[PDB]
Amino acid sequence: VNSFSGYLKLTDNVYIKNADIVEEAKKVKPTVVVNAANVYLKHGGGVAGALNKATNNAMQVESDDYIATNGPLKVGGSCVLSGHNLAKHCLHVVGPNVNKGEDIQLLKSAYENFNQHEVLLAPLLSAGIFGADPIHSLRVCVDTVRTNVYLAVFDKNLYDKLVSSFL
């Protein structure tokens, strides 16, 4: 038993809710919240900009030190940093950005990072401003992640379309 509430169960291990991931993180304080990161950990907009804003820019300060030490992430890669006031940890995961021409096949590699964590609160990778089809992202999620994932979808219209078209 965990504290996630109001989710629709899609599979044995994947759950979905129309929710603002920032507000959901603030309420649940999950062990892991996933950020929709880029390789530079520049949290300017989308999910990343919202999570960072909610940390009063502490996520960005920590991220800048991480990059100065380690260099950029790989597309499809991840790093674990603090969850600040939102979660114990933040798993920064880089899905491919279609608006940069990145290979969509890397979306599966991106989701594989979730398997290193027993339970996660997450957005749909490569959705939103990353330009991928969210229905496809959900399919890759279900077919790749084996750990327990609670997906927060900000847009109610998109949430209803994801549920209604889910196979």
Ligand X SMILES: C[C@@H]1[C@@H](C(=O)O)CCCN1S(=O)(=O)c1c[nH]c2ncc(Cl)cc12
Query: Which positions lie near ligand X, rule CB under 6 A?
Result: 20-22, 36, 45-47, 50, 123-124, 127-129, 153-155, 158
Q: Determine the residue type at 148.
A: N
Residue 95 beta carbon to ligand X: minimum distance, rounded to whole angstroms: 10
Q: Which is nearer to ligand X, 65 or 131 (CB)?
A: 131
Rounded Cα–Cα distance for residues 152 and 140 (Å): 16
Quote the least distance from Cβ 126 to ligand X, whole Å: 9
Residue 1 CB, shortest distance to ligand X, in Å, is 26
DSSP states of 109-136:
HHHHGGGGSSEEEEPPTT-GGG---HHH
Looking at the Cβ atoms of 73 and 159, the one nearer to ligand X is 159
Q: How far apart are CA 25 and CA 110, in angstroms?
A: 21
- Least gap, CB of 19 to ligand X (angstroms): 9
Point out the residue whose Cβ comes nearest to ligand X: 128
CA distance 167 to 162: 10
Closest to 108 (Cα-Cα) out of 150, 133, 75, 144: 144
Residue 14 or 124 having the CB closest to ligand X: 124
